[PDB]
Amino acid sequence: MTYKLILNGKTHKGELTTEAVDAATAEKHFKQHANDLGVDGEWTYDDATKTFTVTE
Numbered sequence: 001m002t003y004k005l006i007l008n009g010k011t012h013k014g015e016l017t018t019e020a021v022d023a024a025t026a027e028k029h030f031k032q033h034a035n036d037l038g039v040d041g042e043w044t045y046d047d048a049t050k051t052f053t054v055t056e
């Protein structure tokens with residue numbers, strides 16, 4: 001399924017998507033992307049919209 005990440009960081013803003021079998025797997029994909037960008041914040045997940053948010 002397609003999951004989304006809302007980047008709501010100090011310098012990085014925007015949204016990324018990933019393809020994943022489940023929410024836990026998507027979270028791993030998004031953590032890798034976030035780490036790549038140096039984004040380091042508070043994570044939440046909403047299953048109704050399959051959307052993660054990371055806020056710095």
Ligand SMILES: [Mg+2]
Pocket residue numbers: 022024
């Ligand atoms: Mg499970």
